[PDB]
Design a binder for these strands. Structure first.
Ligand SMILES: [Mn+2]
Ligand SMILES: [Mn+2]
Ligand SMILES: [Mn+2]
Ligand SMILES: [Mn+2]
Ligand SMILES: [Mn+2]
Lengths: 190, 481, 483, 189
DNA sequence: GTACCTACGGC
DNA sequence: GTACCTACGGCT
DNA sequence: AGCCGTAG
DNA sequence: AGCCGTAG
């Protein structure tokens, strides 16, 4: 379901990973088609912290993201073959949008950690509110999140490696109890 | 008991057919709408989804239509509604949408869970004066609602936006036109019932598609208009320009009506792979919201780009026919109509609507005058009124005493009992006298319209002309000879 | 600040999603036993005036309203939730009144939301009863264009009655359904003894009562669940062994456990025989109809101890299933594992609060009314001067100000007069005022007394609970077999 | 998507062909299941007067119906292997339910004519109110349309086969003009 | 009118 | 969360 | 040949 | 296992 750009110049190229076929249409129409690609995701993606490798590799979502990035995975990861020096994550800005972001970040950290370290990974800042991405025209997506001169993109900084490891394990792994205790400790029911 | 097979086929197939011709796939000649559309618009109306108000979600709107008027699939209704809100589908769009409503790449809309819609200002003119006994309402499918048989349609919607329906045993294919030209055509017809179709084409120069583009010649136009059927050649707007170093390129900025842009480029890239065309080095879609449609084809050096352009018109949808087949519902049965007939029918509809509205306006005016005549009698003799009421046990005895004592109708006497103490202040007494005086002048003006058919006819002219001045726009499609 | 530590983003994002799912998706409220989707559906039927006297409405329209007005999520989620509430085999006391194909015990999916219709049941009335008497705290909706309830008044213990199940984050919930008659007898005992033990309560509430009936083996698992909030309860089908002719026998099953699929269970039994993992079974049939209720037949091979076959079937098939009790619910908008007494305590407090707030409302409302009637007496008594004052005046404002000064009326009594219709000047209207006023004062006294005493308020709750128990109570279905 | 009965005696076995998976579920639930079988259709079905016999065998619904009946086609037919003696057509009492009926009769006439001839074909009479099939509970479908006691099947009889040929080729064939003439002739607005 | 992919926790 | 199957006419 | 647009 | 039921 990928829709690529014209430029073969990875430095200037950017790929947007969006939530829902619904919003994929909109962003497909409002972008700069020359240097901006788009790949829509059907809802919740696989959580690679729990899944084993066979299942990760047969999953189409994962597949489409590896192919479009063109760096390979694990040991075979080659940053030189980066097709975009900006991979940008774009979700609804609700609690489900959050969850989808955590899944994508988990995938990158466990399978494409150098992308993060190389700073190629960004997070989009769409307009917050009651409305989500599927309920927006193509012009109001350009002007707020895809227009370079107007948007504000948060780059993803990886610093303490071991802290990131234990965080991903705790928040996304199969042991529930550590998750539960984390929620209890930090849950601020306003 | 039993059933012959041959008799059962005839009965069952004939029922389906008629139910697709009427009540599915052909437009009405008077409002130019098919049932799903009319039910969408009436719904948008009865839900109060006007341009002033904020949008409502499409799921709610499609939910109401499916349940109150249109017992079919939500898809058959949302899809119909999506096409009504696409500037590239409708020449004058009837829905105002928010969210992804599709593009020229065969790009679907977003889910109805997401998009939202309201009316456009021109839809207002479709529905104007519907609640004023201008058209006939009928029962819905389950008898639990009432729906319009046709809309007031204060502009010529059939020809403005066109239509396409694959019926059973027939089809219709009508192209959009330009509103300014149609109304002027109607105004000419209104001044000379014997005007010729040749004379009418001095107004209506031809179809006018939302996507602009070209038309080649008027021989297909004149045939379609005079007979109902014609074949009309469309072409893209394409120029040849230089790109640098003697190399040229072709730039396409407008494509034919109802042509998928992505499908067309595929066909081009396909013809290139299969070597079915020569001289093409690059092909990009440089289209955006900020520059509009722009499809470039880079030409190989020292190669005749005009030859390549001419072969792309032969081998791609860059040139496309439109088969005009003007079959509409006239008096509830399908008919292939010329242009004049289509305008004639719409005009007799406007006559009807405006006259019905005037009579409705007249009845309601005399009713409200009658009520106020009684209110003024009450003000004139308020002392006696109060006496009369205080001296009674029930509502009925009071109502009978008033009628008797002051020679009031039952409605008048009721209007007096229902009056609130507040309406006795200096200003409320004045408002009542004032409404009376204005209503009398108004009644007079209504009777003057109904007294003469030329004044009615002229009133129709004025209201069309106002619509034209406010909503009429420039021709987009160029008709080239 | 156009950068983000990956650890911090993951921490805040996941915490945001967990909390949201816990307190606003998957866990029920301890007061009304309802999840936000379910609360919005019911609030939707009410606001749409879909009471059970009203005919059925297109479900699509209902889900449309709910989705637009209060619940901005997938229509499939809302509808399926509405479906479950209308299924007699899912809900022990069903809340939605379905017209159309709403599914079967075979995982027969219900028909599409354009094909179904629905309205409230009589018992949902008791859930929503007194919603418009300031009994519960309303809040804004997602877009700020609506008001939705934070909790239904819930005049019967809905949580324990219809039960709950939800997978959340960090935690899941599994509360079984109960018999309303026992619940009400339980709450009443509680209200007569704040220091009542779990054993004493179980004298009323024997155990769960599933809408599918069946058996429960023993009170050990139940006791643990009611005391700790957690425990395993063994649900067994109702099978009997009988003669099918010629010395042959057969096992006949007429009730299956809660949340078991009939088709899928038959697959497993078929699979067992096919793979030769159980011997003595010549045939298997599903002879279930409208007329016979549920009936699964298992042909036992001639000269086989059909009781041994039966026992193996329990062991190796869904014929016997366990229910992992895990009584988690929101208390003060926080998840908690509760035992049975906690759940009954929080509910009684809810009922006390509800009935208390209803009374204050009625008091304020009656007081306001009487204050109007006094303004009306004075009006009718001086009707001649009232009108002159009104007539002599240019504006409403001038009228109002004159009325108040001249007749000692508050602004809202002067308005009440200006709004009055001429037909209120009739002969015996003065008496209706005089009759209504005195009746009002009577009512006022009654209300103030209920608020004067706590024991009277509590007695009012007991009486309104007893009514419900007598109108809605029904026999237990699940047999708790002591073995 | 087929659901058979238990009895393997075609003399008593009946099969109902229902319109749409919604109605499909309803009927599978209310039937007798001992002598009554169900096979739903996912909407409008192929028109076998306009298909060059190449795609007819790619149509899953076509193939499923053959399998259910247990016979064959045309020159390779056998009435004596018919798994049922009552093949009942049951569709919405609206004009689309009628069209589908016509699409089935066409399939029968050109492929299983002997079944029409054998009178094994029937047409269910569901309550002729506005309410479709998917909108009805199971108990209603039983009592009104499925129950052998209260129901009212119409049996299909094949008469002037030449005339039937000419009819089937006008209504369903690829010459629109003759169809269009038939509509105009017999149109009762 | 499908086949239906995913997260989430507890058996 | 997102699917493709069919009918129907006329145009290519 | 297959694609347009309301339908199942 | 995979299935319970709200979500994407
Ligand atoms: Mn969202
Ligand atoms: Mn479809
Ligand atoms: Mn007088
Ligand atoms: Mn879904
Ligand atoms: Mn139907």
């Amino acid at each position: 379901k990928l829709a690529d750009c014209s430029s073969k110049s990875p430095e200037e190229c950017e790929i947007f990973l969006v939530e829902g076929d619904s919003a994929g249409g909109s962003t497909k129409s409002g972008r700069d088609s020359r240097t901006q690609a788009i790949l829509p995701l059907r809802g919740k993606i696989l959580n690679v912290e729990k899944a084993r490798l066979d299942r990760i590799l047969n999953n189409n979502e994962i597949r489409q993201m590896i192919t479009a990035f063109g760096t390979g995975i694990g040991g075979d990861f080659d940053l030189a073959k980066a097709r975009y020096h900006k991979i940008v994550i774009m979700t609804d800005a609700d609690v489900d949008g959050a969850h989808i972001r955590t899944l994508l970040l988990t995938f990158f950290y466990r399978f494409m950690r150098p992308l993060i370290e190389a700073g190629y990974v960004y997070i989009a800042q769409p307009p917050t509110g009651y409305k989500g991405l599927g309920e927006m025209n193509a012009d109001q997506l350009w002007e707020t999140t895809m227009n370079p001169e107007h948007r504000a993109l948060l780059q993803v900084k990886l610093e303490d490696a071991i802290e990131a490891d234990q965080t991903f394990e705790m928040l996304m792994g199969d042991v529930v109890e550590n998750r539960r205790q984390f929620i209890e400790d930090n849950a601020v029911y306003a | 008991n039993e059933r012959n097979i041959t008799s059962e086929m005839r009965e069952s197939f004939l029922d389906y057919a008629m139910s697709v011709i009427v009540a599915r796939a052909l437009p009405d000649v008077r409002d130019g709408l098919k049932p799903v559309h009319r039910r969408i618009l009436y719904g948008l109306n009865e839900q109060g989804m006007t341009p002033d108000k904020s949008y409502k979600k499409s799921a709610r709107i499609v939910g109401d239509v499916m349940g109150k008027y249109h017992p079919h699939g939500d898809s058959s209704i949302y899809e119909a509604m999506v096409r009504m809100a696409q500037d590239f589908s409708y020449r004058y769009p009837l829905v105002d949408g928010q969210g992804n409503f599709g593009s020229m790449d065969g790009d679907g809309a977003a889910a109805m869970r997401f998009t939202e819609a309201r009316m456009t200002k021109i839809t207002l003119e479709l529905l104007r004066d519907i609640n004023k006994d201008t058209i006939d309402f009928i029962d819905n499918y389950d008898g639990n609602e009432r729906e319009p048989s046709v809309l007031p349609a204060r502009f010529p919607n059939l020809l403005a936006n066109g239509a396409s329906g694959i019926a059973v045993g027939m089809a219709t294919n009508i192209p959009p036109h330009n509103l300014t030209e149609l109304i002027n055509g109607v105004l000419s017809l209104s001044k000379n019932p014997d005007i010729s179709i040749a004379e009418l084409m001095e107004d209506i120069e031809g179809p006018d598609f939302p996507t602009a583009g070209l038309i080649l010649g008027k021989s297909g136009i004149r045939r379609a208009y005079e007979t109902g059927r014609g074949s009309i050649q469309m072409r893209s707007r394409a120029v040849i320009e230089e790109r640098g170093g003697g190399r040229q390129r072709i730039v396409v900025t407008e494509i034919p009506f109802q042509v998928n842009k992505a499908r067309m480029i595929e066909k081009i890239a396909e013809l290139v792979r299969d070597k079915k065309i020569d001289g093409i080095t690059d092909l990009r879609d440089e289209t955006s919201l900020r520059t509009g449609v722009r499809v470039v084809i880079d030409v190989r050096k020292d190669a005749n780009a005009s030859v390549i352009l001419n072969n792309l018109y032969k081998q791609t949808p860059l040139q496309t026919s439109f088969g005009v087949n003007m079959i509409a519902l006239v008096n509830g049965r399908p008919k292939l109509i010329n242009l004049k007939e289509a305008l004639v029918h719409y005009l007799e509809h406007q006559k009807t609507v405006v006259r019905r509205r005037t009579q409705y306006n007249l009845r309601k005016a005399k009713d409200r005058a009658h009520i106020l005549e009684g209110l003024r009698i009450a003000l004139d003799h308020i002392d006696e009124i109060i006496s009369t009421i205080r001296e009674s046990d029930t509502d009925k005895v009071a109502m009978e005493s008033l009628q008797q004592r002051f020679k009031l109708s039952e409605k008048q006497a009721q209007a007096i009992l229902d009056m609130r103490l507040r309406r006795l202040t200096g200003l409320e007494r004045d408002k009542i006298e004032a409404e009376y005086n204005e209503l009398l002048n108004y009644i007079s003006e209504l009777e003057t319209i109904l007294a003469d058919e030329e004044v009615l006819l002229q009133l129709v002219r004025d209201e069309l002309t106002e619509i034209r001045d406010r909503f009429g726009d420039d021709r987009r499609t160029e008709i080239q000879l």
